[PDB]
Design an enzyme around this catalytic site. Structure first.
Site, PDB file in Angstrom:
ATOM      1  N   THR A   1       0.793  -1.328   0.061  1.00  0.00           N
ATOM      2  CA  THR A   1       0.033  -0.040  -0.078  1.00  0.00           C
ATOM      3  C   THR A   1       0.816   1.338   0.015  1.00  0.00           C
TER       4      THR A   1
ATOM      5  N   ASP B   1      -9.416  -4.504  -0.278  1.00  0.00           N
ATOM      6  CA  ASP B   1      -8.219  -5.181   0.599  1.00  0.00           C
ATOM      7  C   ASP B   1      -8.387  -6.002   1.599  1.00  0.00           C
TER       8      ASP B   1
ATOM      9  N   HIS C   1      -7.700  -9.938   2.245  1.00  0.00           N
ATOM     10  CA  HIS C   1      -6.715 -10.472   3.518  1.00  0.00           C
ATOM     11  C   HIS C   1      -7.370 -11.631   4.039  1.00  0.00           C
TER      12      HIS C   1
ATOM     13  N   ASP D   1      22.201   2.814  -8.807  1.00  0.00           N
ATOM     14  CA  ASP D   1      21.338   4.054  -8.630  1.00  0.00           C
ATOM     15  C   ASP D   1      20.435   3.879 -10.094  1.00  0.00           C
TER      16      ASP D   1
HETATM   17  C1  LIG Z   1      13.936   8.830 -10.603  1.00  0.00           C
HETATM   18  O1  LIG Z   1      13.574  10.093 -10.726  1.00  0.00           O
HETATM   19  C2  LIG Z   1      14.084  10.758  -9.562  1.00  0.00           C
HETATM   20  C3  LIG Z   1      14.074  12.589  -9.422  1.00  0.00           C
HETATM   21  O2  LIG Z   1      14.311  12.964 -10.985  1.00  0.00           O
HETATM   22  C4  LIG Z   1      15.879  10.774  -9.668  1.00  0.00           C
HETATM   23  O3  LIG Z   1      16.248  10.975  -8.450  1.00  0.00           O
HETATM   24  C5  LIG Z   1      17.328  12.402  -8.612  1.00  0.00           C
HETATM   25  O4  LIG Z   1      18.356  11.728  -9.009  1.00  0.00           O
HETATM   26  C6  LIG Z   1      19.581  12.764  -8.902  1.00  0.00           C
HETATM   27  C7  LIG Z   1      20.922  12.010  -9.356  1.00  0.00           C
HETATM   28  O5  LIG Z   1      20.903  10.805  -8.360  1.00  0.00           O
HETATM   29  C8  LIG Z   1      19.311  13.225  -7.591  1.00  0.00           C
HETATM   30  O6  LIG Z   1      20.545  14.488  -7.694  1.00  0.00           O
HETATM   31  C9  LIG Z   1      21.329  14.812  -6.479  1.00  0.00           C
HETATM   32  O7  LIG Z   1      20.747  15.754  -5.804  1.00  0.00           O
HETATM   33  C10 LIG Z   1      21.528  16.155  -4.561  1.00  0.00           C
HETATM   34  C11 LIG Z   1      20.493  17.228  -3.814  1.00  0.00           C
HETATM   35  O8  LIG Z   1      19.386  16.478  -3.165  1.00  0.00           O
HETATM   36  C12 LIG Z   1      18.493  17.028  -2.277  1.00  0.00           C
HETATM   37  O9  LIG Z   1      17.474  17.868  -2.962  1.00  0.00           O
HETATM   38  C13 LIG Z   1      16.620  17.420  -3.646  1.00  0.00           C
HETATM   39  C14 LIG Z   1      15.795  18.625  -4.608  1.00  0.00           C
HETATM   40  O10 LIG Z   1      14.838  19.020  -3.569  1.00  0.00           O
HETATM   41  C15 LIG Z   1      15.648  16.311  -3.176  1.00  0.00           C
HETATM   42  O11 LIG Z   1      14.762  15.787  -4.139  1.00  0.00           O
HETATM   43  C16 LIG Z   1      16.585  15.158  -2.413  1.00  0.00           C
HETATM   44  O12 LIG Z   1      15.840  14.244  -1.934  1.00  0.00           O
HETATM   45  C17 LIG Z   1      16.494  12.803  -1.772  1.00  0.00           C
HETATM   46  O13 LIG Z   1      17.140  12.837  -0.259  1.00  0.00           O
HETATM   47  C18 LIG Z   1      16.085  13.200   0.679  1.00  0.00           C
HETATM   48  C19 LIG Z   1      16.932  12.900   2.117  1.00  0.00           C
HETATM   49  O14 LIG Z   1      17.817  11.983   1.848  1.00  0.00           O
HETATM   50  C20 LIG Z   1      14.951  11.995   0.610  1.00  0.00           C
HETATM   51  O15 LIG Z   1      13.893  12.687   1.675  1.00  0.00           O
HETATM   52  C21 LIG Z   1      14.485  11.736  -0.813  1.00  0.00           C
HETATM   53  O16 LIG Z   1      13.481  10.710  -0.579  1.00  0.00           O
HETATM   54  C22 LIG Z   1      15.572  11.608  -1.826  1.00  0.00           C
HETATM   55  O17 LIG Z   1      16.219  10.454  -1.631  1.00  0.00           O
HETATM   56  C23 LIG Z   1      16.574   9.946  -2.897  1.00  0.00           C
HETATM   57  O18 LIG Z   1      17.835  10.468  -3.582  1.00  0.00           O
HETATM   58  C24 LIG Z   1      19.057  10.467  -2.806  1.00  0.00           C
HETATM   59  C25 LIG Z   1      20.223  11.244  -3.721  1.00  0.00           C
HETATM   60  O19 LIG Z   1      19.501  12.582  -4.132  1.00  0.00           O
HETATM   61  C26 LIG Z   1      19.509   9.197  -2.532  1.00  0.00           C
HETATM   62  O20 LIG Z   1      20.597   9.266  -1.438  1.00  0.00           O
HETATM   63  C27 LIG Z   1      18.455   8.164  -1.776  1.00  0.00           C
HETATM   64  O21 LIG Z   1      18.819   6.885  -1.734  1.00  0.00           O
HETATM   65  C28 LIG Z   1      17.043   8.297  -2.428  1.00  0.00           C
HETATM   66  O22 LIG Z   1      16.972   7.466  -3.435  1.00  0.00           O
HETATM   67  C29 LIG Z   1      17.741  15.609  -1.499  1.00  0.00           C
HETATM   68  O23 LIG Z   1      17.288  16.322  -0.283  1.00  0.00           O
HETATM   69  C30 LIG Z   1      22.827  16.743  -4.899  1.00  0.00           C
HETATM   70  O24 LIG Z   1      23.418  17.103  -3.614  1.00  0.00           O
HETATM   71  C31 LIG Z   1      23.690  15.810  -5.665  1.00  0.00           C
HETATM   72  O25 LIG Z   1      24.594  16.666  -6.457  1.00  0.00           O
HETATM   73  C32 LIG Z   1      25.998  15.846  -6.288  1.00  0.00           C
HETATM   74  O26 LIG Z   1      26.349  15.175  -7.596  1.00  0.00           O
HETATM   75  C33 LIG Z   1      26.630  16.345  -8.787  1.00  0.00           C
HETATM   76  C34 LIG Z   1      26.783  15.508  -9.854  1.00  0.00           C
HETATM   77  O27 LIG Z   1      26.373  16.212 -10.882  1.00  0.00           O
HETATM   78  C35 LIG Z   1      27.820  17.296  -8.224  1.00  0.00           C
HETATM   79  O28 LIG Z   1      27.491  18.500  -8.877  1.00  0.00           O
HETATM   80  C36 LIG Z   1      27.926  17.445  -6.596  1.00  0.00           C
HETATM   81  O29 LIG Z   1      29.124  17.439  -6.573  1.00  0.00           O
HETATM   82  C37 LIG Z   1      27.196  16.631  -5.570  1.00  0.00           C
HETATM   83  O30 LIG Z   1      28.071  15.903  -5.279  1.00  0.00           O
HETATM   84  C38 LIG Z   1      28.568  16.122  -4.058  1.00  0.00           C
HETATM   85  O31 LIG Z   1      27.870  15.009  -2.927  1.00  0.00           O
HETATM   86  C39 LIG Z   1      28.291  13.654  -3.099  1.00  0.00           C
HETATM   87  C40 LIG Z   1      27.267  12.725  -2.566  1.00  0.00           C
HETATM   88  O32 LIG Z   1      27.054  13.005  -1.221  1.00  0.00           O
HETATM   89  C41 LIG Z   1      29.589  13.608  -2.726  1.00  0.00           C
HETATM   90  O33 LIG Z   1      30.388  12.408  -3.181  1.00  0.00           O
HETATM   91  C42 LIG Z   1      30.680  14.781  -3.597  1.00  0.00           C
HETATM   92  O34 LIG Z   1      31.944  14.640  -3.328  1.00  0.00           O
HETATM   93  C43 LIG Z   1      29.853  15.945  -3.632  1.00  0.00           C
HETATM   94  O35 LIG Z   1      30.212  16.728  -2.220  1.00  0.00           O
HETATM   95  C44 LIG Z   1      22.470  15.273  -6.955  1.00  0.00           C
HETATM   96  O36 LIG Z   1      22.317  16.454  -7.739  1.00  0.00           O
HETATM   97  C45 LIG Z   1      18.230  13.942  -7.118  1.00  0.00           C
HETATM   98  O37 LIG Z   1      18.205  14.417  -5.808  1.00  0.00           O
HETATM   99  C46 LIG Z   1      17.087  12.573  -7.288  1.00  0.00           C
HETATM  100  N1  LIG Z   1      15.917  13.308  -6.740  1.00  0.00           N
HETATM  101  C47 LIG Z   1      14.852  12.527  -6.233  1.00  0.00           C
HETATM  102  C48 LIG Z   1      13.826  13.117  -5.805  1.00  0.00           C
HETATM  103  O38 LIG Z   1      15.269  11.551  -5.769  1.00  0.00           O
HETATM  104  C49 LIG Z   1      15.950   9.374 -10.055  1.00  0.00           C
HETATM  105  O39 LIG Z   1      17.406   9.177 -10.483  1.00  0.00           O
HETATM  106  C50 LIG Z   1      15.092   8.575 -10.981  1.00  0.00           C
HETATM  107  N2  LIG Z   1      15.368   7.136 -11.196  1.00  0.00           N
HETATM  108  C51 LIG Z   1      15.803   6.458 -12.250  1.00  0.00           C
HETATM  109  C52 LIG Z   1      16.221   5.186 -12.284  1.00  0.00           C
HETATM  110  O40 LIG Z   1      16.203   7.231 -13.519  1.00  0.00           O
HETATM  111  C1  LIG Z   2      -4.774   8.522  -3.643  1.00  0.00           C
HETATM  112  C2  LIG Z   2      -3.897   8.697  -2.496  1.00  0.00           C
HETATM  113  C3  LIG Z   2      -4.363   8.136  -1.148  1.00  0.00           C
HETATM  114  C4  LIG Z   2      -3.567   8.373  -0.041  1.00  0.00           C
HETATM  115  O1  LIG Z   2      -3.553   8.116   1.214  1.00  0.00           O
HETATM  116  C5  LIG Z   2      -5.072   7.424   1.573  1.00  0.00           C
HETATM  117  C6  LIG Z   2      -5.315   7.124   2.973  1.00  0.00           C
HETATM  118  N1  LIG Z   2      -6.388   7.513   3.641  1.00  0.00           N
HETATM  119  N2  LIG Z   2      -6.421   6.880   4.847  1.00  0.00           N
HETATM  120  C7  LIG Z   2      -5.260   5.963   4.896  1.00  0.00           C
HETATM  121  O2  LIG Z   2      -5.007   5.227   5.888  1.00  0.00           O
HETATM  122  N3  LIG Z   2      -4.735   6.049   3.601  1.00  0.00           N
HETATM  123  C8  LIG Z   2      -3.316   5.262   3.305  1.00  0.00           C
HETATM  124  C9  LIG Z   2      -3.612   3.673   3.414  1.00  0.00           C
HETATM  125  C10 LIG Z   2      -2.230   5.751   4.045  1.00  0.00           C
HETATM  126  C11 LIG Z   2      -2.136   8.927  -0.263  1.00  0.00           C
HETATM  127  C12 LIG Z   2      -1.028   9.013   0.802  1.00  0.00           C
HETATM  128  C13 LIG Z   2       0.262   9.342   0.163  1.00  0.00           C
HETATM  129  C14 LIG Z   2      -1.555  10.034   1.878  1.00  0.00           C
HETATM  130  C15 LIG Z   2      -0.812   7.685   1.304  1.00  0.00           C
HETATM  131  C16 LIG Z   2      -1.622   9.216  -1.418  1.00  0.00           C
HETATM  132  C17 LIG Z   2      -2.767   8.977  -2.809  1.00  0.00           C
HETATM  133  C18 LIG Z   2      -2.385   9.332  -4.077  1.00  0.00           C
HETATM  134  N4  LIG Z   2      -1.869   9.727  -5.046  1.00  0.00           N
HETATM  135 CA   LIG Z   3      -3.061  -1.719  -0.267  1.00  0.00          CA
HETATM  136 CA   LIG Z   4      25.170   4.397 -11.687  1.00  0.00          CA
HETATM  137 ZN   LIG Z   5      -3.439  -5.207   2.102  1.00  0.00          ZN
END
Ligand SMILES: *[C@@H]1O[C@H](CO)[C@@H](O[C@@H]2O[C@H](CO)[C@@H](O[C@@H]3O[C@H](CO[C@H]4O[C@H](CO)[C@@H](O)[C@H](O[C@H]5O[C@H](CO)[C@@H](O)[C@H](O)[C@@H]5O[C@H]5O[C@H](CO)[C@@H](O)[C@H](O)[C@@H]5O)[C@@H]4O)[C@@H](O)[C@H](O[C@H]4O[C@H](CO)[C@@H](O)[C@H](O)[C@@H]4O[C@H]4O[C@H](CO)[C@@H](O)[C@H](O)[C@@H]4O)[C@@H]3O)[C@H](O)[C@H]2NC(C)=O)[C@H](O)[C@H]1NC(C)=O
Ligand SMILES: Cc1cc(OCc2n[nH]c(=O)n2C(C)C)c(C(C)(C)C)cc1C#N
Ligand SMILES: [Ca+2]
Ligand SMILES: [Ca+2]
Ligand SMILES: [Zn+2]
Ligand code: NA
Ligand code: NA
EC number: 3.1.4.39
Length: 806
Positions: free
Chosen positions: A159, A261, A265, A687
């Site tokens: 979910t 769901d 279950h 990645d």
């Molecule tokens: C699916 O789609 C998504 C979205 O388009 C793709 O994900 C993007 O991929 C990019 C490349 O991997 C990545 O870019 C990096 O962003 C860094 C800044 O990140 C923060 O800000 C953004 C913007 O708001 C935010 O979205 C991020 O959120 C992530 O992290 C938080 C907290 O951890 C989580 O809440 C969130 O869920 C998300 O996590 C995911 O992504 C991170 C990586 O960002 C993973 O670690 C997690 O596992 C998880 O999957 C952040 O809060 C930025 O810092 C990076 O820049 C580095 O690299 C560039 C090279 O171009 C360089 O300029 C810099 O030097 C820098 O390097 C420095 O840091 C290095 C590492 O620490 C270090 O080694 C160096 O020496 C340097 O100091 C980079 O630009 C982007 O953030 C994500 N976005 C998201 C939403 O995930 C994804 O790739 C797609 N998938 C496929 C298969 O296509």
């Molecule tokens: C359609 C929709 C429903 C939804 O949540 C529905 C919900 N109501 N009560 C409850 O327990 N749930 C789930 C089980 C957490 C969410 C969350 C990201 C907030 C989970 C996203 C989206 C989308 N797009």
């Molecule tokens: Ca479900």
């Molecule tokens: Ca790679």
């Molecule tokens: Zn279920």
């Protein structure tokens, strides 16, 4: 602490969160224990139920009632949903013929058609057909609007990951909600279904639709509904919000149902007890559509009817126990059930070893119902590795089974008959999509597609710019009547070099040998033509792939294949060839068994060498264009060029050789010719994205030849298989794979048997979308076809699943 002595008077289901010095009247209030004292009295009225009856018609308003049947109710926006039917002689929405909605027909002051997301938990795709007799409202939505035969969820098919993927367009590894249960080792905190940690914003990554909307000036209703609020009240709340003044009214709304769901279950996906929950969900749809019709919105609102995952037959007795495999069972923590995730119980335990646990779990019993993987080895189509909350050790559980740590976890923690969470290509896990409204097509069936794509479309439906996500924007244009998104192809970043003959044989010192010194203007002019690209139209059918990053590479032409040869990685990025239905398979002649030939177009310094393979006791080599498929004895020599060679572990060469020698010809026979593009992939940090040269963790011993983590192939042919792949006038058909390049075949428990018994099964498990290969290679395929770009985007998102009929 909450001062619960404020009042919800005029505040019921307020859209703004008052979180600080105030009691709440929104949906989250129950969950936070923060509702005002009078929340139930004022906001959750139930008096007289949910339906008007004749005697109630034109009643005097009584503010106690759950809903109203007095004359003032329409303007108040709070009638019972069946009000016009019971009291004003109107028909139910379901009873009206469907009429195409060619344009939105919206009341004055509506700036755009609102979007309502109607989400149903555990609604398995086959319920649409199997339950159709008992779901007339859903059946009308489906038959009149746009529907897919099924929609593929994300892995794990739980979910929370799926609902947040719907909201973000992101894979779970990217949004952070990687399971219903999680441990995050950086936070040192646990996320669970029960309790309050799950509301902390630090778990929830990316940008969900309501935030995308809000930042771009579009108001949103709640997406979360408290479990105790009856569905009838959820619908009445949406309908009341829809009657707000323009400046206050949201444009996007979500309804959520815990059913089917919840019952699934208990009873299994097709338990006789399942008919009632389906009826009841259909009734809720009917209430919503009747309500929209009352507000004159039934030909203005876009409605999406969508599930999060299906439901499979699973019972306690089909549980594998890790205690039957591991001696050290108490040193591990398992996240159990329809997937398994293992980590050390104690980070102070230095006799914890992932390698011995994986080995103790590998092919240990004959009909073993789960398979262990280091997360980086899981099928790349799952995109389930790049997150610290995903444990290094993963168990892929067979459908219909569970895994648990020990027996006492199963009886001291049979109840259930259904569960879900399995591999997202499993037929029972597929769920539903219907879109109905002015912006969707009329009576249109679309092929199955993945739920990561919907975020983009929902943003289209609302005129929003999507945040960066994993959908491929434009791939679902064929669902829409209007509001399509017209993407442009990305620009090529690196242009190729086209080398001629530039090196003499004696300049190379690669330690390679070939018995090729065997001796005509007839044939000589001809071979010069082949090296210049004269057969290129046969072998490169959809244009050369564009290279979308900065690099140095050469196009190399041959009689039988074309390649894009990287001077940086010392091997092709891609190799393209066509195999007609008529092609014949031959063997590698005895004199050519160990033949590798310098390529006089490419310098010694940008070439692999044979000595590196001689000295690397673990590594051998394979070829990208298979010598077995050479068009003539003389063309076969091209296949042994050092520029067609790639490093392969001997164990992987078993797989590769059988693919090239047996399967390609089988596909060409079946599909009326195929075009194949093969190449290496480097994803050492798992990645899902192409590695730069400084991320490569392994090289062929003593050299700068990088070792691929995976090999891919993209196999294209004509959708109308009456036309041969190389003379196809219409849509294309594709299947692809991304095989892990592993030094053993431990993944395949039957690998001691002949390749005919296990190789193709491995390849099916590693099926992929072209888009997955694009992310992994920085290449962009199908740049020159006769097809529209959106149709090509849809082809690039296709996944060939090998599951039978849904
Ligand atoms: C699916 O789609 C998504 C979205 O388009 C793709 O994900 C993007 O991929 C990019 C490349 O991997 C990545 O870019 C990096 O962003 C860094 C800044 O990140 C923060 O800000 C953004 C913007 O708001 C935010 O979205 C991020 O959120 C992530 O992290 C938080 C907290 O951890 C989580 O809440 C969130 O869920 C998300 O996590 C995911 O992504 C991170 C990586 O960002 C993973 O670690 C997690 O596992 C998880 O999957 C952040 O809060 C930025 O810092 C990076 O820049 C580095 O690299 C560039 C090279 O171009 C360089 O300029 C810099 O030097 C820098 O390097 C420095 O840091 C290095 C590492 O620490 C270090 O080694 C160096 O020496 C340097 O100091 C980079 O630009 C982007 O953030 C994500 N976005 C998201 C939403 O995930 C994804 O790739 C797609 N998938 C496929 C298969 O296509
Ligand atoms: C359609 C929709 C429903 C939804 O949540 C529905 C919900 N109501 N009560 C409850 O327990 N749930 C789930 C089980 C957490 C969410 C969350 C990201 C907030 C989970 C996203 C989206 C989308 N797009
Ligand atoms: Ca479900
Ligand atoms: Ca790679
Ligand atoms: Zn279920
Ligand atoms: Na070797
Ligand atoms: Na094996």
């Amino acid at each position: 602490w909450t001062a619960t002595s404020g009042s919800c008077k005029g505040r019921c289901f307020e859209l703004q969160e008052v979180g600080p010095p105030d009691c709440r009247c929104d949906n989250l209030c129950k969950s936070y224990s923060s509702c005002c004292h009078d929340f139930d009295e004022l906001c959750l009225k139930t008096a007289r139920g949910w339906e008007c009856t004749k005697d109630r018609c034109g009643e005097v308003r009584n503010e106690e009632n759950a809903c109203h049947c007095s004359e003032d109710c329409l303007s108040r926006g709070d009638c019972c949903t069946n009000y016009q039917v019971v009291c004003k002689g109107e028909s139910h929405w379901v009873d009206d013929d469907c009429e195409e909605i060619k344009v939105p027909e919206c009341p004055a002051g509506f700036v755009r058609p609102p979007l309502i997301i109607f989400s149903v938990d555990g609604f398995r795709a086959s319920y649409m057909k199997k339950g159709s007799k008992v779901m007339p409202n859903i059946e009308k939505l489906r038959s009149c609007g746009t529907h897919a035969p099924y929609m593929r969820p994300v892995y794990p098919t739980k979910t929370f990951p799926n609902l947040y993927t719907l909201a973000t367009g992101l894979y779970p590894e990217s949004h952070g909600i990687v399971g219903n249960s999680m441990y995050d080792p950086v936070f040192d905190a646990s996320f669970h279904l029960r309790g309050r940690e799950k509301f902390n914003h630090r778990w929830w990554g990316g940008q969900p639709l309501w935030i995308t909307a809000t930042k771009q000036g579009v108001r949103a209703g709640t997406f979360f509904w408290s479990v105790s609020i009856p569905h009838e009240r959820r619908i009445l709340t949406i309908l009341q919000w829809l009657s707000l003044p323009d400046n206050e009214r949201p444009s996007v709304y979500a309804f959520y149902s815990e059913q089917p769901d919840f019952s699934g279950h208990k009873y299994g996906p097709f338990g006789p007890e399942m008919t009632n929950p389906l009826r009841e969900i259909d009734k809720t749809v009917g209430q919503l559509m009747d309500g929209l019709k009352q507000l004159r919105l039934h030909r203005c609102v876009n409605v999406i009817f969508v599930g999060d995952h299906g439901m499979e037959d699973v019972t306690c007795d089909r549980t594998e126990f890790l205690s039957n495999y591991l001696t050290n069972v108490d040193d591990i923590t398992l996240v159990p059930g329809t997937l398994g995730r293992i980590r050390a119980k104690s980070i102070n335990n230095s006799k914890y070893d992932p390698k011995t646990i994986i080995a103790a779990l590998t092919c240990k019993k004959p009909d073993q119902h789960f398979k262990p993987y280091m997360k980086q080895h899981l099928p790349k189509r799952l995109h389930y590795a790049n997150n610290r909350r995903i444990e290094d050790i993963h168990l892929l559980v067979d459908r219909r089974w569970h895994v648990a740590r020990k027996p006492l976890d199963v009886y001291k923690k049979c109840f259930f008959q259904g569960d879900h969470g399995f591999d997202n290509k499993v037929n029972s896990m597929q769920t539903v999509f219907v879109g109905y409204g002015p912006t969707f097509k009329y009576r249109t069936k679309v092929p199955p597609f993945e739920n990561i794509e919907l975020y983009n479309v929902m943003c289209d439906l609302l005129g929003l710019k999507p945040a960066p996500n994993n959908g491929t924007h434009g791939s679902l244009n064929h669902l829409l009547r209007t509001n399509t998104f017209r993407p442009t192809m990305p620009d090529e970043v690196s242009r190729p070099n086209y080398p001629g003959i530039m090196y003499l044989q004696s300049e190379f010192d690669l330690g390679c040998t070939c018995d090729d010194k065997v001796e005509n203007k007839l044939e000589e002019l001809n071979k010069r033509l082949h090296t210049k690209g004269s057969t290129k139209e046969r072998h490169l059918l959809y244009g050369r792939p564009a290279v979308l990053y900065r690099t140095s590479y050469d196009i190399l032409y041959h009689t039988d294949f074309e390649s894009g040869y990287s001077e940086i990685f010392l091997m092709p990025l891609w190799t393209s060839y066509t195999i007609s239905k008529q092609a014949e398979v031959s063997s590698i002649p005895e004199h050519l068994t160990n033949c590798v030939r310098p390529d006089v177009r490419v310098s010694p310094g940008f070439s692999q060498n044979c000595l590196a393979y001689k000295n690397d006791k673990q590594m051998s080599y394979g070829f990208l264009f298979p010598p077995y498929l050479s068009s003539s004895p003389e063309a076969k020599y091209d296949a042994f060029l050092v520029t067609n060679m790639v490093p392969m572990y001997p164990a992987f060469k078993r797989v590769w050789a059988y693919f090239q020698r047996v399967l390609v010809k089988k596909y060409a026979s079946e599909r009326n010719g195929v075009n194949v593009i093969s190449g290496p992939i480097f994803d050492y940090n798992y990645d899902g994205l192409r590695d730069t040269e400084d991320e490569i963790k392994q090289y062929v011993e003593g050299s700068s030849i990088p070792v691929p983590t995976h090999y891919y192939s993209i196999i294209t042919s004509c959708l109308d298989f009456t036309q041969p792949a190389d003379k196809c006038d219409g849509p294309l058909s594709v299947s692809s794979f991304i095989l892990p390049h592993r030094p053993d075949n431990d993944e395949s428990c039957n690998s001691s048997e002949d390749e005919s018994k296990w190789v193709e099964e491995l390849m099916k498990m590693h099926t992929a979308r072209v888009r997955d290969i694009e992310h992994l290679t920085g290449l962009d395929f199908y740049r020159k076809t006769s097809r529209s770009y959106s149709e090509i985007l849809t082809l690039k998102t296709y996944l060939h699943t090998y599951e039978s009929e849904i």
